[PDB]
Amino acid sequence: LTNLVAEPFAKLEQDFGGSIGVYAMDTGSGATVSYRAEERFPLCSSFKGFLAAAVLARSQQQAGLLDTPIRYGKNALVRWSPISEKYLTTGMTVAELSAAAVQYSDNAAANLLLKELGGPAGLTAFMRSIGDTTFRLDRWQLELNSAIPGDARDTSSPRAVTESLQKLTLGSALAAPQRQQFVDWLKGNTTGNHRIRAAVPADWAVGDKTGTCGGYGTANDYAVVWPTGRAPIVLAVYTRAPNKDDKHSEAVIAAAARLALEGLGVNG
């Protein structure tokens, strides 16, 4: 049930000047679209979605975790912390930091939560605990965004991202309340309007998390999409390119998502 219908991903990545990796699963039938799906691509900020899921998983055993107030100093405010900079003088709760990390890609929030989980190895351990043997986080922000060609640090594959996203948003990896909270945070993301969402009709529900590394044409998005009248679709689109100065493209990500939905026979 893989690639029952061929789609011109090769022409798309060639026009882009790099590599595009796509894995999309129709959770009803199990049919998939797969292109470079087992190659590694840099996670960039897309790790922050799985970080929030790991926090939610811990909150199942720590009843008061999400409401715990976290205070931080100016030293914690790294570039692009649009929410946490507004609460420097007050603090924020773990839940608020998690929402900011998912919905605004807030860097200070993500760093504080990463510290809570035991750093890159702790997030990697959480992903192993749901059966993901591909994901690896190795560095803190923002060194993890280097996107060096051939470097496996801070990477996963489109397939493993999709498989893990399915487990966390639709499967049993989180308890039901935490699952729906993860979904709600993804639905509330503000940074992905020009990526997978741009391929999704306005009358369908969707949640996503973006990543943008800032070198080597490297950017990505993963999403769960609820077309009306049929089972949800989970998909991941990751890009990279050979030269440090190559620019990423949101349009290429949206276009790859359209091809994935077309390949699955989802009328959009």
Author numbering: 25 to 57, 59 to 252, 254 to 294
Quote the study's own text.
Klebsiella pneumoniae carbapenemase (KPC) is a widespread SBL that hydrolyzes carbapenems, the most potent β-lactams; known KPC variants differ in turnover of expanded-spectrum oxyimino-cephalosporins (ESOCs), for example, cefotaxime and ceftazidime. SBLs neutralize β-lactams via a hydrolytically labile covalent acyl–enzyme intermediate. Here, we compare ESOC hydrolysis by the parent enzyme KPC-2 and its clinically observed double variant (P104R/V240G) KPC-4. To further study the basis for KPC activity against the ESOCs cefotaxime and ceftazidime, deacylation-deficient mutants of KPC-2 and KPC-4 were generated by conservative substitution of the general base E166 (35) with the isosteric residue Gln (KPC-2E166Q and KPC-4E166Q).
In KPC-4, however, a small change in the position of Q166 (compared with E166 in the unmodified enzyme) results in repositioning (by ∼2.4 Å) of the putative deacylating water. The positions of other active-site residues are identical to those observed in native KPC-4.
